[PDB]
Write a protein that binds this ligand. Structure first.
Ligand code: HEM
Ligand code: HEM
Ligand SMILES: [Cl-]
Ligand SMILES: [Cl-]
Lengths: 181, 181
């Protein structure tokens, strides 16, 4: 199943360490996030919010980039990856109406998204989900997990991305920091 | 709503003229297709099949291609466009695992999808829906409508697309021919 759901409330496999409402309307603070590999129509009991998304095909990466990523990127659910961050992102209408060459160019040519991100591997594992096409309030759910030794680095990476040309098109962002139970 | 449903059965705005089961398992012949702008969970009565998909962003086309398209493409629902064709398509796993340059190269550089399609405008109006990400049996719903004068040309377009390098990755195709009621 390509669909993943994230419910904030009182149960789950992850403990909320903090929520930072970086840009736009935030998410309600909760104790835990429950992560399910399927849809959830039935709004669980004592739950503040539900995010969902699907895994999909590659939209921007070229073959050489894919090859570099595969050389180094870690698997999920390594024993030592006890910290996680879930970061929902929405981009602007003006981003979405641009053509495929235009977005590619802002993403890599000007922003160096992949080249920059590669400097933080293999410390950081990641998953990417899409949800604009489902009509969610966010366009993407991003997922990162790592050992604590890598926390400072991850924080450096966030600040680099947010200085990029790409991030001028980001109109909503929340970081949910977690700890594995 | 970006979601569209197509219900084959005994009612709808469109009459089935014929169905051609071009490649893979076919669809049952029905009298009518009912088209709805929304998700439909409840399979209507006396209905043989439901297709669905969503309108999404551009995945391949570059700015100049977009500009060329906008200059000549017709709107849907012209009074003259009394014929339509719904064409579901599934592409192979080998296509989906390819990187974005690879796919782009096969789509335009090798198959001239956009350049070839442009020759059939403004006679032909079109809409593209995506459904792989929803778990559907097909990856895409393609929709075409035109006045009868253009039926010949449209048939010619189909045979050209099917001769392209792109069509080598196509593992499932049905033509549903329709007449507006
Ligand atoms: C940690 C190393 C990172 C790597 C190696 C990396 C790599 C990538 C790659 C290769 C893509 C393109 C996927 C495709 O072609 O479909 C991508 C997309 C994305 N990444 Fe990252 N990324 C990293 C970190 C981050 C971080 C920290 C964020 C956000 C805080 C982020 C946000 C995004 C978003 C939103 C997309 C989707 C862009 C779109 O489709 O418009 N990435 N990432
Ligand atoms: C009539 C003129 C046509 C034009 C101008 C045309 C144009 C296009 C364009 C520009 C795209 C790319 C959209 C994007 O970047 O996301 C596209 C996608 C597509 N077209 Fe066509 N098209 C035409 C006819 C057809 C026909 C007859 C078929 C199939 C029988 C077809 C099947 C597709 C499919 C499946 C896609 C999605 C490709 C993918 O993501 O792999 N088109 N079309
Ligand atoms: Cl990914
Ligand atoms: Cl379209």
């Amino acid at each position: 199943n390509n669909r993943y759901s994230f419910i904030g409330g009182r149960t789950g496999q992850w403990q909320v360490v903090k929520i930072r409402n970086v840009l736009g309307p935030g998410l309600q603070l909760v104790e835990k996030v429950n992560i399910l590999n399927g849809a959830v129509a039935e709004i669980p009991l004592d739950s503040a919010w539900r995010l969902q998304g699907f895994a999909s095909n590659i939209r921007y990466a070229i073959r050489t980039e894919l090859e570099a990523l595969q050389a180094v990127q870690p698997m999920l659910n390594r024993a030592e990856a006890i910290l996680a961050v879930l970061i929902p992102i929405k981009k602007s209408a003006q981003w979405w109406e641009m053509a495929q060459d235009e977005r590619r160019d802002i993403f890599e040519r000007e922003s160096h998204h992949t080249a920059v991100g590669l400097e933080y591997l293999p410390g950081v594992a990641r998953r990417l989900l899409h949800c604009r096409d489902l009509g969610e309030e966010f366009d993407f759910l991003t997922w990162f997990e790592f050992a604590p030794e890598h926390s400072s680095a991850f924080n450096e990476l966030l600040l680099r991305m947010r200085a990029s040309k790409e991030w001028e098109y980001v109109e909503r962002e929340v970081e949910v920091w977690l700890k594995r139970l």
